[PDB]
Amino acid sequence: NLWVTVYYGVPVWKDAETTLFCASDAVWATHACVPTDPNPQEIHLENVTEEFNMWKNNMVEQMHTDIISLWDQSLKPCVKLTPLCVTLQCTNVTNNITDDMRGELKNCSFNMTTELRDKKQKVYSLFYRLDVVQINNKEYRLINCNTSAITQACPKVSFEPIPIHYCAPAGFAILKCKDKKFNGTGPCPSVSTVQCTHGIKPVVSTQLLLNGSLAEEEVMIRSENITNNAKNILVQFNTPVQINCTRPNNNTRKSIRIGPGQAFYATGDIIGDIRQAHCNVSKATWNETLGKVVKQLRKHFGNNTIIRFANSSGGDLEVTTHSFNCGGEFFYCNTSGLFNSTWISNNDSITLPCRIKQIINMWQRIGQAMYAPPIQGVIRCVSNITGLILTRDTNSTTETFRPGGGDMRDNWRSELYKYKVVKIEPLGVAPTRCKRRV
Amino acid sequence: EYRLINCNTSAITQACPKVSFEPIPIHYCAPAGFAILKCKDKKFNGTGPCPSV
Amino acid sequence: VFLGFLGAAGSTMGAASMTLTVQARNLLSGIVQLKLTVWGIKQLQARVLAVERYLRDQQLLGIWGCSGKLICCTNVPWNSSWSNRNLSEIWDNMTWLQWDKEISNYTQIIYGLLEESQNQQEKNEQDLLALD
Amino acid sequence: VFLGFLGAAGSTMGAASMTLTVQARNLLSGIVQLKLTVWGIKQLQARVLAVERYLRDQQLLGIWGCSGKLICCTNVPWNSSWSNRNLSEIWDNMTWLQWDKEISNYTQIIYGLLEESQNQQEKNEQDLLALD
Amino acid sequence: VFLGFLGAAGSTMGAASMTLTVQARNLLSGIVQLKLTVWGIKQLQARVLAVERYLRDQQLLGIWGCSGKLICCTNVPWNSSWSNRNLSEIWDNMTWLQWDKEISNYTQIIYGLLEESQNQQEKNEQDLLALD
Ligand SMILES: *[C@@H]1O[C@H](CO)[C@@H](O[C@@H]2O[C@H](CO)[C@@H](O[C@@H]3O[C@H](CO)[C@@H](O)[C@H](O)[C@@H]3O)[C@H](O)[C@H]2NC(C)=O)[C@H](O)[C@H]1NC(C)=O
Ligand SMILES: *[C@@H]1O[C@H](CO)[C@@H](O[C@@H]2O[C@H](CO)[C@@H](O[C@@H]3O[C@H](CO)[C@@H](O)[C@H](O)[C@@H]3O)[C@H](O)[C@H]2NC(C)=O)[C@H](O)[C@H]1NC(C)=O
Ligand SMILES: *[C@@H]1O[C@H](CO)[C@@H](O[C@@H]2O[C@H](CO)[C@@H](O[C@@H]3O[C@H](CO)[C@@H](O)[C@H](O)[C@@H]3O)[C@H](O)[C@H]2NC(C)=O)[C@H](O)[C@H]1NC(C)=O
Ligand SMILES: *[C@@H]1O[C@H](CO)[C@@H](O[C@@H]2O[C@H](CO)[C@@H](O[C@@H]3O[C@H](CO)[C@@H](O)[C@H](O)[C@@H]3O)[C@H](O)[C@H]2NC(C)=O)[C@H](O)[C@H]1NC(C)=O
Ligand SMILES: *[C@@H]1O[C@H](CO)[C@@H](O[C@@H]2O[C@H](CO)[C@@H](O[C@@H]3O[C@H](CO)[C@@H](O)[C@H](O)[C@@H]3O)[C@H](O)[C@H]2NC(C)=O)[C@H](O)[C@H]1NC(C)=O
Ligand SMILES: *[C@@H]1O[C@H](CO)[C@@H](O[C@@H]2O[C@H](CO)[C@@H](O[C@@H]3O[C@H](CO)[C@@H](O)[C@H](O)[C@@H]3O)[C@H](O)[C@H]2NC(C)=O)[C@H](O)[C@H]1NC(C)=O
Ligand SMILES: *[C@@H]1O[C@H](CO)[C@@H](O[C@@H]2O[C@H](CO)[C@@H](O[C@@H]3O[C@H](CO)[C@@H](O)[C@H](O)[C@@H]3O)[C@H](O)[C@H]2NC(C)=O)[C@H](O)[C@H]1NC(C)=O
Ligand SMILES: *[C@@H]1O[C@H](CO)[C@@H](O[C@@H]2O[C@H](CO)[C@@H](O)[C@H](O)[C@H]2NC(C)=O)[C@H](O)[C@H]1NC(C)=O
Ligand SMILES: *[C@@H]1O[C@H](CO)[C@@H](O[C@@H]2O[C@H](CO)[C@@H](O)[C@H](O)[C@H]2NC(C)=O)[C@H](O)[C@H]1NC(C)=O
Ligand SMILES: *[C@@H]1O[C@H](CO)[C@@H](O[C@@H]2O[C@H](CO)[C@@H](O)[C@H](O)[C@H]2NC(C)=O)[C@H](O)[C@H]1NC(C)=O
Ligand SMILES: *[C@@H]1O[C@H](CO)[C@@H](O[C@@H]2O[C@H](CO)[C@@H](O)[C@H](O)[C@H]2NC(C)=O)[C@H](O)[C@H]1NC(C)=O
Ligand SMILES: *[C@@H]1O[C@H](CO)[C@@H](O[C@@H]2O[C@H](CO)[C@@H](O)[C@H](O)[C@H]2NC(C)=O)[C@H](O)[C@H]1NC(C)=O
Ligand SMILES: *[C@@H]1O[C@H](CO)[C@@H](O[C@@H]2O[C@H](CO)[C@@H](O)[C@H](O)[C@H]2NC(C)=O)[C@H](O)[C@H]1NC(C)=O
Ligand SMILES: *[C@@H]1O[C@H](CO)[C@@H](O[C@@H]2O[C@H](CO)[C@@H](O)[C@H](O)[C@H]2NC(C)=O)[C@H](O)[C@H]1NC(C)=O
Ligand SMILES: *[C@@H]1O[C@H](CO)[C@@H](O[C@@H]2O[C@H](CO)[C@@H](O)[C@H](O)[C@H]2NC(C)=O)[C@H](O)[C@H]1NC(C)=O
Ligand SMILES: *[C@@H]1O[C@H](CO)[C@@H](O[C@@H]2O[C@H](CO)[C@@H](O)[C@H](O)[C@H]2NC(C)=O)[C@H](O)[C@H]1NC(C)=O
Ligand SMILES: *[C@@H]1O[C@H](CO)[C@@H](O)[C@H](O)[C@H]1NC(C)=O
Ligand SMILES: *[C@@H]1O[C@H](CO)[C@@H](O)[C@H](O)[C@H]1NC(C)=O
Ligand SMILES: *[C@@H]1O[C@H](CO)[C@@H](O)[C@H](O)[C@H]1NC(C)=O
Ligand SMILES: *[C@@H]1O[C@H](CO)[C@@H](O)[C@H](O)[C@H]1NC(C)=O
Ligand SMILES: *[C@@H]1O[C@H](CO)[C@@H](O)[C@H](O)[C@H]1NC(C)=O
Ligand SMILES: *[C@@H]1O[C@H](CO)[C@@H](O)[C@H](O)[C@H]1NC(C)=O
Ligand SMILES: *[C@@H]1O[C@H](CO)[C@@H](O)[C@H](O)[C@H]1NC(C)=O
């Protein structure tokens, strides 16, 4: 007869959420974080299979709110720009006649309170017409002042995305499938496990995904519900698509001592190649990759349907255009130049017009706003487009797709789908032929 | 015309009239597993072996 | 042969029992190594939860007179209603995950007798053997 | 019969010993399950103090060679000065609370020999039995 | 004779072994007893680190089938390459600090066999003695 035998160290686990913590090397917000191991360990697990589900992966939720928390903490100790909310006296800026630049900035002046709380000083600064609005030269207002206060980001702190690793506490395991195929959820024939995750950069962007990871095999299409056009579609590329964006303005920073003590960085003068900031895209590369994407689409909609690509529905600029950070500066680009195509039934280069804003609102959050300091000198950078955030638009053939975003949990999820966290249960029992003596 | 010297560098805060600045003897302790070692050697160069620990 | 953490997870319960310690070590792990700040109380909380997580079950093994754990026998007989399979149908043809899939239904029920029967009776008895 | 947490508190020490485990479990309990905030570091502090509170005495039982606790014997004889009563006057006619009322006077004194005597001598001895 | 915490630190390893418990007690110590504030999370952190510091190694002694610690034997033979000295050259003529000075070189190496060999083999074996 068999008896109850007690076992400990049993290799079993249940899907469970706990509090994850970071790790990264030894700028943005990361210093108070445990350095990574010089030899991150892993182990493929043979005969071990189980389901993943990226759409209920609470790792995303934590990461999201943690990044937000970091953001706020990095701003509290910086200078508040409360006394900037004043009536502005502004005029057009006579760019090289006649007018290709459309101005876009105003030579605003105003009676400003200085360190000598008492006698004020008439000063001036160049502002983008996206930041200011006419009251009622003419009178203008900082747009934020009708919604909330605004804080100047410190000139020392940066916004450069840094690779972050996530680790689980003892008793919890980081599981990672290596299956090159994945529908977004279901069993994985090839499952491994790791100490911690790979370095993920906290890149904030809409519409287009930047500097992410690459997919293997073919282009990956992932969606909570492909047939439901109330949902959206994640597209992961196989090959990095280069994009090179430039701001050809060797401008200065006429910092103004609007104390007491604390200093404000206003916009000095704009000189150099007065052209609109824009992005350069390899056209043939875009066409080629887009085609590869359409192949996938064909595979989930039929071998006799029509695929069209267009821009967004419009509205809030933050959603309408492609937003991203380069070197502290915030760009808004008209991606109509990319998302304008079509496919049937079965250099060259592209220039994307961009705009610059200085007053921005993070993560759709209202109640506060952050002032970007102007960055001195010409700003230009390059990155890898590694995926798309697409939405699905008389429904028997032609379908139209367009870029979206808004919810930045989407961005984190586009990477964390490779991971899941489980809770180990060391204690188990089993029937064994054994009668225990004294 | 004169100016408070601090105003060109930063803001300034008034120390509370109740709080004092009198130095008070503080003792330091280590958590369990750690030991506080103390040489009693009247001689010491600033570093090196102590015959009497 | 050293396999690695959970290296035997994809094997039969008999096979897996070979290397329970390789797992045991990292069940508590250890090491790891402007105030507050994000992570400031998260590494705190997590590292705490690890300790609790561990001891909560370790104490049960303390109560279930074994202590010298990973494996130990009892004087509680196995009730046939708790998944009636043969040893070769169990130990030589089933993983630990597959095992739990079934037996998990009677977890607290089995714990009842483990928490008690023997622990109660093994003692008293001894106290009586100490009479002389 | 399951009585409940401290269910035997109002009985003789002999009777109470029947169900020490029912209490033992909840001596550490476990489970439980804008930053800071009131309670934010209080649940923290309390849950910590529980762990320390437990182990501080558990280690003593570790030192006092038993480990398989709730009950164990020693090789230290009882000094008659420590409340000279008969077994029936003690075990069959006194609660644990009433017991402490008296014996608490010699707590550290008794701990001295428990902390030592046997722990010292049981060993060495064994080391010597291992000679052959 | 009570010496005090680390009172035998300046003696031979043989002599020092007499009073290991006097040290053992304070390895975890216990007791100790506007928000945040300096010290507010430092006493916290420190007291935590003490608990972890302790258990991290205590678990190893749990794995190394002894538990009844301070001293216990194994079934692992000593490799002569690990500082080849005689017992009188070691135990009767060397402090623990001096000992570590040398043997520390093979710490993890020795731990390998302690973590395993016996722990693996002592068991199975027993399981087989339980056949009848
Ligand atoms: C801050 O800049 C504002 C303009 O942005 C200056 O406003 C000027 O303020 C004075 C006092 O309110 C106005 O002067 C008065 O005007 C009336 C009519 O012209 C005249 O009857 C009075 O004798 C007196 O001069 C002035 O018109 C107004 N300017 C405008 C454009 O409205 C203000 O002076 C500036 N402060 C600093 C310190 O420069
Ligand atoms: C933008 O508005 C600012 C005022 O808010 C204008 O500032 C003016 O800038 C010029 C060039 O720096 C200054 O002119 C120079 O002044 C000195 C002394 O008066 C003179 O020696 C030079 O020959 C030259 O004229 C001017 O004084 C300054 N005004 C003030 C109030 O400081 C600037 O012109 C505006 N830009 C646009 C396009 O209108
Ligand atoms: C994917 O999501 C889509 C939409 O979010 C789900 O589509 C829903 O499918 C059901 C079944 O075809 C439709 O229900 C039927 O609707 C008609 C009219 O409302 C009603 O007469 C029937 O009694 C029935 O409820 C539902 O309307 C349709 N929703 C929409 C937006 O078209 C689909 O079920 C989702 N798949 C997954 C696996 O959940
Ligand atoms: C994306 O590109 C499409 C064209 O491919 C742009 O379509 C434009 O969308 C707006 C909003 O639906 C239309 O404006 C409305 O037009 C009516 C009539 O002209 C007018 O009564 C309204 O006051 C309003 O302006 C506009 O006509 C339409 N253009 C065409 C060619 O149909 C859309 O603006 C583009 N989005 C981005 C962000 O540029
Ligand atoms: C992963 O699961 C596979 C089955 O899907 C397990 O395969 C087993 O692997 C071992 C090693 O290759 C085979 O054992 C060898 O078999 C031969 C003939 O029976 C015997 O001569 C050797 O002494 C040895 O036992 C075993 O037959 C093979 N099983 C089958 C179905 O092919 C593997 O063990 C699994 N790994 C885990 C960790 O459980
Ligand atoms: C609470 O204290 C009361 C006394 O104040 C304890 O009463 C005892 O209760 C038990 C159960 O009813 C009685 O035991 C039974 O007695 C009869 C005759 O002696 C015997 O035939 C049965 O086998 C059984 O032992 C006991 O006599 C009674 N004591 C007295 C003084 O009446 C009760 O045990 C206390 N509870 C706690 C948890 O200690
Ligand atoms: C500190 O180190 C000193 C040596 O530097 C150790 O000295 C030893 O002290 C004991 C006690 O005074 C001596 O033991 C006695 O020796 C006599 C003759 O051998 C014997 O008749 C007694 O039964 C007893 O053993 C010992 O000889 C002396 N050693 C020497 C070199 O003089 C002392 O033990 C050290 N303390 C620590 C804690 O290790
Ligand atoms: C600043 O220049 C802009 C053009 O760059 C002028 O814009 C005109 O503004 C009025 C009022 O909104 C409109 O009636 C005109 O149709 C606008 N013109 C165009 C080209 O859109 C504005 O008048 C200029 N201000 C100054 C003082 O001359
Ligand atoms: C706060 O100011 C904003 C502009 O900075 C106002 O926004 C306008 O809101 C109405 C209603 O949604 C729209 O018709 C306008 O097009 C918006 N303007 C822009 C710039 O987007 C808003 O009305 C202001 N609130 C207060 C109470 O006046
Ligand atoms: C763009 O992504 C490509 C991967 O497709 C990256 O390629 C790496 O490029 C460097 C420089 O040539 C090589 O050292 C690496 O070995 C390349 N990787 C592979 C996979 O071939 C490139 O680094 C990416 N750029 C950005 C800015 O991240
Ligand atoms: C769409 O038609 C293509 C052929 O034009 C089909 O292609 C097959 O796809 C599967 C999956 O990749 C392969 O197993 C076959 O070998 C492919 N055939 C050939 C000719 O390459 C695809 O099955 C079609 N889809 C529909 C729904 O019928
Ligand atoms: C959408 O892109 C197409 C090219 O893919 C653009 O097509 C141009 O359309 C105009 C109007 O019919 C013609 O004058 C051009 O010759 C067309 N170009 C070519 C390549 O055929 C169209 O302009 C684009 N729309 C957007 C808003 O940029
Ligand atoms: C801030 O004010 C201080 C005086 O309160 C200025 O200090 C002078 O600095 C120069 C350069 O080091 C020295 O030549 C003077 O002797 C300093 N004065 C004293 C009182 O030490 C400093 O220049 C001021 N900064 C600003 C921007 O004006
Ligand atoms: C094994 O445990 C089962 C419950 O898991 C016990 O089942 C009882 O069996 C008897 C006989 O069929 C019935 O009278 C009871 O109603 C059953 N209980 C329930 C919960 O269904 C069985 O008694 C147990 N065997 C041992 C030896 O205790
Ligand atoms: C029992 O412990 C008591 C102290 O609790 C010891 O009492 C000593 O007894 C002798 C004889 O009466 C006196 O010389 C001492 O002065 C007493 N000590 C004190 C503290 O009063 C007694 O020795 C102990 N018995 C055992 C066997 O050790
Ligand atoms: C004792 O351990 C040493 C290593 O610390 C072992 O050394 C090996 O000895 C043999 C014979 O000289 C050599 O072939 C190996 O290359 C040595 N290893 C190294 C690391 O130098 C020795 O085998 C061990 N003895 C026991 C019984 O295991
Ligand atoms: C993209 O290339 C495809 C063929 O691969 C072609 O059908 C389409 O016209 C191309 N687009 C561009 C802009 O040339
Ligand atoms: C138990 O296994 C034997 C063979 O060893 C088999 O005959 C019997 O069917 C097995 N049990 C079950 C419930 O079938
Ligand atoms: C365990 O029982 C639950 C109902 O209590 C049931 O949902 C599940 O299927 C059961 N598992 C087994 C193996 O029968
Ligand atoms: C011990 O109990 C006996 C009866 O069992 C009694 O004769 C004696 O008085 C008791 N002890 C005390 C101190 O009285
Ligand atoms: C314990 O002794 C203390 C004095 O040390 C005294 O106050 C108390 O009454 C004593 N208890 C006993 C039972 O005598
Ligand atoms: C071991 O000690 C003996 C004396 O007991 C000695 O003869 C021999 O030299 C010692 N070992 C070493 C390595 O010398
Ligand atoms: C231990 O070996 C290290 C090199 O691995 C060396 O630096 C040190 O001297 C060694 N100690 C012994 C006692 O030889």
Residue numbers in the entry:
A (entry chain A): 33 to 58, 68 to 141, 150 to 185, 188 to 309, 312 to 321, 321A, 322 to 398, 411 to 457, ...
B (entry chain D): 190 to 242
C (entry chain B), D (entry chain E), E (entry chain F): 518 to 550, 566 to 664
What does the paper say about this structure?
One infant-derived bnAb, BF520.1, demonstrated cross-clade neutralization breadth and targeted the V3-glycan region of HIV Env. In contrast to most adult-derived bnAbs, BF520.1 has limited SHM (VH = 6.6%, VK = 5% nt). Here, we identify the naive antibody precursor of BF520.1, describe the subsequent evolution of this antibody lineage, and explore the structural basis for HIV binding for the first and currently only infant-derived HIV-specific bnAb that has been described. We find that 2% SHM is sufficient for broad neutralization for this antibody lineage and that substitutions in the first complementarity-determining region (CDRL1) of the kappa chain are critical for neutralization breadth.
Single-particle cryo-electron microscopy was used to gain insight into the interaction of BF520.1 Fab and BG505.SOSIP.664 trimer, which is a clade A transmitted envelope variant from a Kenyan infant who was in the same cohort as BF520. The positioning of the CDRH loops in our structural model indicates that they make multiple contacts with both protein and N-linked glycans. The CDRH1 loop is in close proximity to the base of the gp120 V3-loop, with N32 oriented towards the conserved GDIR sequence, consistent with increased neutralization observed when asparagine is introduced at position 32 on the CDRH1 loop (Y32N substitution). Adjacent residues of CDRH1, as well as the CDRH2 loop are located proximal to the N301 glycan. It is unclear if residue 52 (N52A substitution) in CDRH2 mediates direct contact between either the GDIR sequence or N301 glycan; however, it is plausible that substitution for alanine could influence loop positioning such that residues H54 and S55 would interact with the N301 glycan. The relative orientation of the CDRH3 loop suggests it may interact with the V3 GDIR sequence, as well as the N332 glycan, though given variability in CDRH3 positioning between homology models, the contacts are less certain for this loop. The structure of the Env trimer in complex with BF520.1 supports a role for the BF520.1 VK in neutralization through extensive contacts between the CDRL1 loop and the N332 glycan. Based upon the BF520.1 homology model, N28, A30, and Y31, which were implicated in nAb breadth, are positioned directly adjacent to the N332 glycan, although we cannot unambiguously identify the position of specific residues. The position of CDRL3 loop suggests it likely does not interact with the BG505 trimer or key glycans, which may explain why it does not contain mutations that contribute to BF520.1 breadth. In contrast, the slight rotation of BF520.1 relative to PGT128 places the CDRL1 loop in closer proximity to the N332 glycan.
